[PDB]
mmCIF file with all atom_site columns, C-alpha atoms and ligand atoms in Angstrom:
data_model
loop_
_atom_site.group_PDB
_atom_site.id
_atom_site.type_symbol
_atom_site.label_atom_id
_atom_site.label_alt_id
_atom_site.label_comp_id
_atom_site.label_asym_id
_atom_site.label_entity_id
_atom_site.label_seq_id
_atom_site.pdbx_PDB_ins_code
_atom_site.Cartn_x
_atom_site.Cartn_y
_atom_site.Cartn_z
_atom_site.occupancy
_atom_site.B_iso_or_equiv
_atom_site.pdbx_formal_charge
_atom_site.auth_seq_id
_atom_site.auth_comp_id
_atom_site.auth_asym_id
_atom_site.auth_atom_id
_atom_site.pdbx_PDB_model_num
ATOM   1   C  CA  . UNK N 1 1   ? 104.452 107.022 77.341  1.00 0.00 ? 1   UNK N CA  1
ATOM   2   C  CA  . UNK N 1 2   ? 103.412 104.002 79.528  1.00 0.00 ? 2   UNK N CA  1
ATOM   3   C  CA  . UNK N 1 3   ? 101.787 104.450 83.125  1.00 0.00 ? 3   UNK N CA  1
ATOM   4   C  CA  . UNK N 1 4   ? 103.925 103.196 86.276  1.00 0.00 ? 4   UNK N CA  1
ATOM   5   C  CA  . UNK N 1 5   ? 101.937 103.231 89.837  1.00 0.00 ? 5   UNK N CA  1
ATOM   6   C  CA  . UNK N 1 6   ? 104.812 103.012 92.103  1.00 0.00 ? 6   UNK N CA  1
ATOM   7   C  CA  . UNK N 1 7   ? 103.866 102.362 95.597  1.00 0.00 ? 7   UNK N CA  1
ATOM   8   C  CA  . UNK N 1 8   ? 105.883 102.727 99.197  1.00 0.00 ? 8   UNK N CA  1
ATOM   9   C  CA  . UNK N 1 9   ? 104.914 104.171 102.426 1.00 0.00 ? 9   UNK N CA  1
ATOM   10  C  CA  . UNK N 1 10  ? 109.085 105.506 102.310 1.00 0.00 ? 10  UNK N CA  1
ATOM   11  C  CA  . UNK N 1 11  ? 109.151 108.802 100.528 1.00 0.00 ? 11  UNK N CA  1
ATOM   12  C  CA  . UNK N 1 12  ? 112.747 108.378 99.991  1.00 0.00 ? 12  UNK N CA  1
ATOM   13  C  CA  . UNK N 1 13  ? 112.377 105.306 97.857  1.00 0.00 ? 13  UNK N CA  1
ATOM   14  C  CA  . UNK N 1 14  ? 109.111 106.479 96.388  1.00 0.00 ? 14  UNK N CA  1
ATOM   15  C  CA  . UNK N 1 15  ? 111.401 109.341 95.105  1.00 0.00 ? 15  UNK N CA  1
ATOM   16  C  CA  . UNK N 1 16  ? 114.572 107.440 94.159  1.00 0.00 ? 16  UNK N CA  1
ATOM   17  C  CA  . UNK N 1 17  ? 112.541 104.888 91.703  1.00 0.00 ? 17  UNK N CA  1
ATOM   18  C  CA  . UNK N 1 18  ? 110.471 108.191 90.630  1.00 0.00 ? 18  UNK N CA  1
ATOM   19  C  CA  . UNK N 1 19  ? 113.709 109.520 89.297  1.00 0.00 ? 19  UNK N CA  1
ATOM   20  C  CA  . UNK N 1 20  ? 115.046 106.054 87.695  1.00 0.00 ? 20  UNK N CA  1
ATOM   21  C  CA  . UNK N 1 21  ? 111.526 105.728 85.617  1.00 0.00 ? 21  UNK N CA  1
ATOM   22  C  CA  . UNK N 1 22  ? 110.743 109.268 84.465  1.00 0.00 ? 22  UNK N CA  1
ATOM   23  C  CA  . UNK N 1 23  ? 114.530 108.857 83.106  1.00 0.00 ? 23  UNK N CA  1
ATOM   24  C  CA  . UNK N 1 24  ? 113.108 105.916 81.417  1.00 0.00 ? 24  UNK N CA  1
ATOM   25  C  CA  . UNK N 1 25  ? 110.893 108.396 80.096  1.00 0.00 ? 25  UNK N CA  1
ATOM   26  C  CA  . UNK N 1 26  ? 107.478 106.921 81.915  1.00 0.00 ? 26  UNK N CA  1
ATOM   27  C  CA  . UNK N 1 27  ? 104.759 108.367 83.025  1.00 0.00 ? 27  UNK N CA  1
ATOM   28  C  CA  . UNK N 1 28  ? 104.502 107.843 86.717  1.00 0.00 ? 28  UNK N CA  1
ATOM   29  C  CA  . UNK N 1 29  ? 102.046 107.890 89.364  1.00 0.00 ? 29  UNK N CA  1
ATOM   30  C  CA  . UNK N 1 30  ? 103.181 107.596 93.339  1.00 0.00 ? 30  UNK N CA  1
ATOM   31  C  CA  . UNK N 1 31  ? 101.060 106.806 96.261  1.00 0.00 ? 31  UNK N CA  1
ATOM   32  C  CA  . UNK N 1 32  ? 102.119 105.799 99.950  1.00 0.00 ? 32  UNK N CA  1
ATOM   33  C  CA  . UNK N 1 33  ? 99.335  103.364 100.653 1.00 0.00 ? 33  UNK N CA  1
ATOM   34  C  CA  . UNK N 1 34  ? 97.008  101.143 99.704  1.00 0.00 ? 34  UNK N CA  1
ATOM   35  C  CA  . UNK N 1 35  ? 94.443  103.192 99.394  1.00 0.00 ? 35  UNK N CA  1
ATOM   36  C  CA  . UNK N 1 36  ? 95.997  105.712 97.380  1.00 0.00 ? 36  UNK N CA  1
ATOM   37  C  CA  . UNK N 1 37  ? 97.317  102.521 95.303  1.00 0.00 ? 37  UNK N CA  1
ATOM   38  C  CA  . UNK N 1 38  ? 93.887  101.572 94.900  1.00 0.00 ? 38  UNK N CA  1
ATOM   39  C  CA  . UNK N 1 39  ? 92.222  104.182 93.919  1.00 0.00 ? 39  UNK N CA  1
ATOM   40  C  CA  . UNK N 1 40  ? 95.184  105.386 91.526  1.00 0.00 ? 40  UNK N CA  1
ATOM   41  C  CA  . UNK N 1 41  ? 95.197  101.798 89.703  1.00 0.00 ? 41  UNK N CA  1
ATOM   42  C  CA  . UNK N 1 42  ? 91.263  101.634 89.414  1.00 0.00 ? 42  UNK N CA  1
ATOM   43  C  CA  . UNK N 1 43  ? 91.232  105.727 87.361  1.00 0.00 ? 43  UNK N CA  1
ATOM   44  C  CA  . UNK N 1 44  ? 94.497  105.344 85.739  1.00 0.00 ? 44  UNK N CA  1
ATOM   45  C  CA  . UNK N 1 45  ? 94.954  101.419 84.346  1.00 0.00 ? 45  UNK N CA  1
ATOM   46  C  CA  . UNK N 1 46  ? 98.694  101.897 84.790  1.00 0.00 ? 46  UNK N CA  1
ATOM   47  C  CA  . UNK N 1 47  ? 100.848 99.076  82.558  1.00 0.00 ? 47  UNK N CA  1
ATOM   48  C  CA  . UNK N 1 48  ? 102.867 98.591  85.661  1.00 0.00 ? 48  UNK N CA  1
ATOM   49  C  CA  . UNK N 1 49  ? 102.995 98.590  89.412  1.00 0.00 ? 49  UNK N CA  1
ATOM   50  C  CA  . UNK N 1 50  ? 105.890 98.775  91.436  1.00 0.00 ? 50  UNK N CA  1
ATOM   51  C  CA  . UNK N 1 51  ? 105.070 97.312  95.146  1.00 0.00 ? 51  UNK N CA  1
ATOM   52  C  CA  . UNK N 1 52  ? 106.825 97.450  98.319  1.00 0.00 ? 52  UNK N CA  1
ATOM   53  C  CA  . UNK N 1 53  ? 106.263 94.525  100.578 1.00 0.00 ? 53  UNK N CA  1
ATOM   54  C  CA  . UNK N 1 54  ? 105.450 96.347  103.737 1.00 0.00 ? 54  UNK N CA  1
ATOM   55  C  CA  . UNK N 1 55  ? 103.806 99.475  103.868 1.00 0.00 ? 55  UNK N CA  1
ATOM   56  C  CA  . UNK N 1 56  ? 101.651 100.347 107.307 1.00 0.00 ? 56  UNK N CA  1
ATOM   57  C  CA  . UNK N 1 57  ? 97.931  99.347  107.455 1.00 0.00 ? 57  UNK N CA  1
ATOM   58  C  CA  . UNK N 1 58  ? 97.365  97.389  103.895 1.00 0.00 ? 58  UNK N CA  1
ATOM   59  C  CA  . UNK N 1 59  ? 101.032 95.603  103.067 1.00 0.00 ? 59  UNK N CA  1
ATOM   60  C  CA  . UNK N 1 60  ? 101.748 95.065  99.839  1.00 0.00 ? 60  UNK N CA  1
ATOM   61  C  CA  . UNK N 1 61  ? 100.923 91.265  99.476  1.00 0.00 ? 61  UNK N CA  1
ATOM   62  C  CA  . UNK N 1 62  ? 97.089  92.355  100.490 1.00 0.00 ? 62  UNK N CA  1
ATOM   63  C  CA  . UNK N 1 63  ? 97.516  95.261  97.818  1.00 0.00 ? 63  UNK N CA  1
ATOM   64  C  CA  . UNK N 1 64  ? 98.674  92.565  95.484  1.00 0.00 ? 64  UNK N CA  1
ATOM   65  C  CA  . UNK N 1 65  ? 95.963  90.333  96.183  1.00 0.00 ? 65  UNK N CA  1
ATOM   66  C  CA  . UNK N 1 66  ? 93.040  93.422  95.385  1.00 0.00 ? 66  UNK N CA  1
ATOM   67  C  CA  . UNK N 1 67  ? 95.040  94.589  91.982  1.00 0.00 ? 67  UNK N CA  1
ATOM   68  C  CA  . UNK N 1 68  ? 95.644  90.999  90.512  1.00 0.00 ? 68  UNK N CA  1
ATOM   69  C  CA  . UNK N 1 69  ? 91.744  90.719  91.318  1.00 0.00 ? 69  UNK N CA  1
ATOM   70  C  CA  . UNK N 1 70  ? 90.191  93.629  89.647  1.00 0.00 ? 70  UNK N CA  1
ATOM   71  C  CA  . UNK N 1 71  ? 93.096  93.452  86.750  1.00 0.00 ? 71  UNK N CA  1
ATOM   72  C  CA  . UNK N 1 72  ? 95.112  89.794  86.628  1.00 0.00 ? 72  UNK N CA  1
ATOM   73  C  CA  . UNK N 1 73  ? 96.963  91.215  83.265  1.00 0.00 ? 73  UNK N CA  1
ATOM   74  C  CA  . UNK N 1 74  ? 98.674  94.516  84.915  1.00 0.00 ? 74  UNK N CA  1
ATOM   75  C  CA  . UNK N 1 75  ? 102.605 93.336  85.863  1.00 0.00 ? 75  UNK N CA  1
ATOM   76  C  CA  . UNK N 1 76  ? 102.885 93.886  89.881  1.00 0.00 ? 76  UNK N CA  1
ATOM   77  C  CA  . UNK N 1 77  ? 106.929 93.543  90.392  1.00 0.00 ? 77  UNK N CA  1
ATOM   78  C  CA  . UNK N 1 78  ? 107.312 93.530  94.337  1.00 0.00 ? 78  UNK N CA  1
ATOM   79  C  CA  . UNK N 1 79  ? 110.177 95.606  96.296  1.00 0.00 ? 79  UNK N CA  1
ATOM   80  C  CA  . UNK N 1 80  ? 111.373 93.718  98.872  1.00 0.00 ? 80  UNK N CA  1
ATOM   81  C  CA  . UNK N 1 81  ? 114.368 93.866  102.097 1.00 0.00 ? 81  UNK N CA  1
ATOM   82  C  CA  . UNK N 1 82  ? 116.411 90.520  101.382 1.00 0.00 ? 82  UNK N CA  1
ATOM   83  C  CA  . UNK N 1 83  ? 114.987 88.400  104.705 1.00 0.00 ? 83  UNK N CA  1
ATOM   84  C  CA  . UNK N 1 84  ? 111.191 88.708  103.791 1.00 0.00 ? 84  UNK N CA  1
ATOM   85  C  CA  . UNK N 1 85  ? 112.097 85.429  102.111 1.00 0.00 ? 85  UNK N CA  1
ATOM   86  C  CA  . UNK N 1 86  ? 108.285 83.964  103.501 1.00 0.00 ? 86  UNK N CA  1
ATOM   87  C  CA  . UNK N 1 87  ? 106.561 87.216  101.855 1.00 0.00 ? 87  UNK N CA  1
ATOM   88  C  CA  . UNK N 1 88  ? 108.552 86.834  98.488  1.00 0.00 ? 88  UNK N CA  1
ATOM   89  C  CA  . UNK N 1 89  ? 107.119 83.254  98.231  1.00 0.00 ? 89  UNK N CA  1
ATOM   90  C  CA  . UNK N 1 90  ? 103.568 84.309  99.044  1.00 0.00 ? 90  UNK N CA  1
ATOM   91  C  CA  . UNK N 1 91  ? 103.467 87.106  96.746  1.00 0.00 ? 91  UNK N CA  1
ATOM   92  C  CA  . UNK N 1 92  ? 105.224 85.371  93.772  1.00 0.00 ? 92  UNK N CA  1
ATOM   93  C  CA  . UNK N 1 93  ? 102.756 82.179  94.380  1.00 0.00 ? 93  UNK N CA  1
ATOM   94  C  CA  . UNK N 1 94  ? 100.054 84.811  94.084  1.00 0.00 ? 94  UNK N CA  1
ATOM   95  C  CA  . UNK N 1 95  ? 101.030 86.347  90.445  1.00 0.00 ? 95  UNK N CA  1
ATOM   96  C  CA  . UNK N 1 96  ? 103.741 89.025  90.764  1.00 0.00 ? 96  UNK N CA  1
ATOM   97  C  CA  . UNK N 1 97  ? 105.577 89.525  87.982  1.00 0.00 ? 97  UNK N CA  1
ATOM   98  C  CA  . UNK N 1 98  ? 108.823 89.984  89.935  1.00 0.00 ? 98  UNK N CA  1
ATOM   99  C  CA  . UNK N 1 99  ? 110.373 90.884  92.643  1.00 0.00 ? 99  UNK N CA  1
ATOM   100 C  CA  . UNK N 1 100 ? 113.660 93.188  93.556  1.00 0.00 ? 100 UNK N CA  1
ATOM   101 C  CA  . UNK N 1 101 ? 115.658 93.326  96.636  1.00 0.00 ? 101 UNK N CA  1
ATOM   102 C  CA  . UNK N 1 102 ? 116.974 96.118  98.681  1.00 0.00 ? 102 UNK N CA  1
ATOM   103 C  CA  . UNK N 1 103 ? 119.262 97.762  98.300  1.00 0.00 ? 103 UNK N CA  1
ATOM   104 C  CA  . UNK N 1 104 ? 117.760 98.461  94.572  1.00 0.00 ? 104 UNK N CA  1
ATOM   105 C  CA  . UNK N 1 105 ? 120.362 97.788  91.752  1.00 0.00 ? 105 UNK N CA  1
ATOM   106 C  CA  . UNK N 1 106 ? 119.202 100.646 89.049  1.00 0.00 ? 106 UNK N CA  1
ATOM   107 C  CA  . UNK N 1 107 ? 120.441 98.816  86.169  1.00 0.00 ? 107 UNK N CA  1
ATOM   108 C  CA  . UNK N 1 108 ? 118.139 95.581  87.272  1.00 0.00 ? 108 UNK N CA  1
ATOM   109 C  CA  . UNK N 1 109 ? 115.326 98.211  87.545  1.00 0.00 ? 109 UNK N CA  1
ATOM   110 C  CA  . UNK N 1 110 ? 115.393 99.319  84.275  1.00 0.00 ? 110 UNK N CA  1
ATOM   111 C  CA  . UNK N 1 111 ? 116.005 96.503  82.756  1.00 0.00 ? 111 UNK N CA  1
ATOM   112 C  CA  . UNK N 1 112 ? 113.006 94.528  84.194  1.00 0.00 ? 112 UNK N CA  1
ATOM   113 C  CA  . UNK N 1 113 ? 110.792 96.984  83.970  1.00 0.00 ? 113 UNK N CA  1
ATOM   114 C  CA  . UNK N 1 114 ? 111.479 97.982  80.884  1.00 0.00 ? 114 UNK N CA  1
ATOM   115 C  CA  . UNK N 1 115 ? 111.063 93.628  79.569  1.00 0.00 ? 115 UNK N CA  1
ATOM   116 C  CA  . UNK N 1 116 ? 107.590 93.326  81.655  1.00 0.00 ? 116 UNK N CA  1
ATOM   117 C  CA  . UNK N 1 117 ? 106.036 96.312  80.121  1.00 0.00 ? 117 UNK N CA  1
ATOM   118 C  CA  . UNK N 1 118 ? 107.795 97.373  76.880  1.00 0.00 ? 118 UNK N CA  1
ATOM   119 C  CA  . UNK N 1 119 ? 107.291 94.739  74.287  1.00 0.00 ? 119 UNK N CA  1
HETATM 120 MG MG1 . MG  V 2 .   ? 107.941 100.032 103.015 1.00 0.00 ? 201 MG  V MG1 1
#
């Protein structure tokens, strides 16, 4: 139905939130770094991106930075552990949409998702 790019260098998690949002009945897309993030947003124009924080090489505030660039409208909704408080700031005073702490509720998930992207 509607395209989510879900990001994380963590296959576990990259998984996990896989499973929550095809259940949701989505359409979803995975990569494990920036570059795959990149690329993947620039083909596919996803209606949502789900970002982890830190991911190896290009973290997520520097992916934020290049998809809020090339497409300010997409919703970026950052995952986050609960003591990157200085990150959260940064990346919500640079236009996410959201953020969610670790460890993920499912129901908060959904639920946001499901209000940024689906009327
Ligand atoms: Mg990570």
């Amino acid at each position: 139905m509607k395209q989510l790019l879900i990001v994380d260098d963590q296959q576990g998690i990259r998984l996990l939130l896989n499973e929550v949002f095809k259940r949701e009945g989505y359409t979803t897309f995975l990569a494990a770094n920036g570059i795959e993030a990149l690329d993947i947003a620039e083909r596919v124009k996803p209606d949502g991106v789900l970002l982890d924080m830190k991911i190896p090489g290009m973290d997520g505030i520097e992916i934020l930075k290049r998809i809020k660039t090339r497409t300010p409208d997409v919703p970026v909704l950052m995952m986050t552990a609960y003591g990157e408080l200085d990150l959260i700031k940064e990346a919500m005073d640079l236009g996410a949409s959201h953020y969610f702490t670790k460890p993920f509720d499912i129901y908060e998930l959904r639920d946001a998702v499901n209000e940024m992207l689906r009327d």
